[PDB]
Symmetry: C3
Subunit: 105 residues, 3 copies
């Protein structure tokens, strides 16, 4: 059987950072795959001020058994103090793809 999987959402200030973060967690085998979507814009209040920054949206694939380690790793290498680090559950997926995801870890 395959271990339950998840997708992790994280945002980086730019493409270089996003790729460095992705390369690192992939090497550490904490994620099986990482999708980087550049050209994004994030709006949020930071200490009372409305900010609007350019960001690269990251979507990382891994399993529940690695999510904790993945977030800890991402947070350490991330330039931001409190980066976006959210985990969404994958309730279902193609069996063979999930096997590859599991095998990659």
């Amino acid at each position: 059987s395959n271990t339950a999987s998840v997708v992790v959402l994280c945002t980086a200030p730019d493409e270089a950072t996003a790729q460095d973060l992705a390369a690192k967690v992939l090497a550490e085998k904490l994620a099986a795959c990482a999708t980087l979507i550049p050209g994004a814009t994030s709006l949020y209040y930071w200490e009372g001020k409305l900010e609007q920054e350019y960001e690269v949206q990251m979507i990382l694939k891994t399993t529940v058994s690695h999510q904790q380690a993945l977030l800890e790793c991402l947070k350490s290498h991330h330039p931001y103090q409190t980066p976006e680090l959210l985990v969404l559950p994958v309730t279902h997926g193609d069996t063979d793809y999930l096997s590859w995801l599991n095998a990659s870890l």
Copy 2:
């Protein structure tokens, strides 16, 4: 305190940015990420439509999700825009703390 992620689409960046600033000011979401350059396909009144759109991803909590949806829906140019809620099973403690603190 359970966090959730909300999916919404807008016709252009101006409208998307307007929607975000609005819900952020009302403290119904802590953050909104906009992704332009997208395309949506769906049937409408019998024909397959293909529209250029901006994908929105907002972060909030279960306690605020309903109010967030109503507000977005109200200011959205469309009558029935995409408004979907996905559950967050885990997240960095500090980020989640910041998210909750940013809400109403």
Copy 3:
């Protein structure tokens, strides 16, 4: 009114993504498909870091159709084993969800 879900699938290019979306829509296995080109997928293969420019697909459907959608998507997909993951929708705008269920 069946529970809805969102399906993530990655396509190698814009043409493939639109063809896949049109196909599943015609088959009534999804209600809507959002395509985000310009995405980069990173993963190890044969021992070396692969970097592919792809299209991120986000499809809307219900749990009663998730399995059929995945099978249709995989079959028409040019890759042998494309990314095919299902995320649950725990909530959403009532009218939107009704339209979603009705489109199926």
